[PDB]
Design a protein around this ligand. Structure first.
Ligand SMILES: CC(C)(O/N=C(\C(=O)NCB(O)O)c1csc(N)n1)C(=O)O
Length: 261
């Protein structure tokens, strides 16, 4: 790579943002060199379901020296279900193990699964506390309008957290391996980062989708013969009804992939 290719990439990101009525927040990091391609990296964006990565890491941290926690089954009932719970809705009654809940919320974005895990940790403030413990002073989970700082982070802060969690040593080696295993098996991101990077790269990712055309994807790509590349993409729009743009997310990843190859 080179600084000049990165300057070119950043202008391409600006041009990409002009194709929709909203904001593009982007960080890609080449871990081989620390080279960073960024756009609106220090602005806050609603993180939507991408917080589930930080969730799951916090749960994995509780399991250090207590691997049996992952096999502990958590009961819940129908009145405990919230909207969009495709996995948990099938296991009302006896419930699911902690590991199963982590997998459900990472791979299917199951919302009840996330709430149960948030509860296990002691509430949303425990997730924020966990983020602070790994050097993220920006992330805030306030609950399980544009401009509201609640439930937001910046692309820069999330990129650093993704890097430390999936590539670095925020977690112990075994827990890092497990977080990667879950995110590698994500089912919701086929049209996002995965669509923009080379087919030969392995991708561990977590998506986020919300109103105001909010379309997010964060994660790490593992090329077969070089160092991991961290990708964080946040998009959000001015119109509440607007669909999230999978193609824009894929295109942003593709711009950075081309620059780093
Ligand atoms: C409605 C319910 C179940 O979930 N709300 C969500 C949501 O559906 N997140 C799904 B995700 O981004 O894959 C959400 C967060 S920001 C936004 N817009 N929607 C909830 O929190 O009660």
């Amino acid at each position: 790579g080179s600084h000049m290719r990165n300057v070119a990439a950043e202008q391409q990101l600006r041009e990409l943002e002009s194709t929709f009525d909203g904001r593009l927040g982007f960080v890609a990091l080449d871990t081989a060199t620390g080279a960073r391609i960024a756009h609106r990296a220090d602005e806050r964006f609603p993180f939507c379901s991408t917080f589930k990565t930080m969730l799951s890491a916090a749960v994995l941290a509780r399991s250090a020296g207590d691997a049996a926690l992952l096999q502990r089954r958590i009961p819940y009932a129908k009145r405990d279900l919230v909207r969009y719970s495709p996995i948990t809705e099938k296991h009302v009654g006896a419930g699911m193990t902690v590991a199963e809940l982590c997998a459900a919320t990472l791979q299917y974005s199951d919302n009840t699964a996330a709430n149960l895990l948030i509860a296990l940790l002691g509430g949303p403030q425990a997730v924020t506390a966990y983020a602070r413990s790994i050097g993220d002073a920006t992330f805030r989970l306030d609950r399980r309008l544009p401009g509201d700082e609640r439930d937001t982070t910046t692309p820069a802060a999330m990129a650093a957290s993704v890097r430390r969690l999936l590539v670095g040593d925020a977690l112990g080696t075994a827990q890092r391996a497990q977080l990667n295993a879950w995110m590698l098996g994500n089912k919701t991101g086929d049209a996002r980062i995965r669509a923009g990077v080379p087919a030969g790269w392995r991708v561990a990712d977590k998506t986020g989708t919300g109103d105001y055309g909010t379309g997010n994807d964060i994660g790490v790509a593992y090329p077969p013969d070089r160092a991991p590349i961290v990708f964080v993409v946040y998009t959000t729009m001015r119109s509440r009804n607007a669909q999230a743009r999978d193609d824009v997310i894929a295109s942003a990843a593709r711009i950075a992939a081309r620059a780093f190859v």
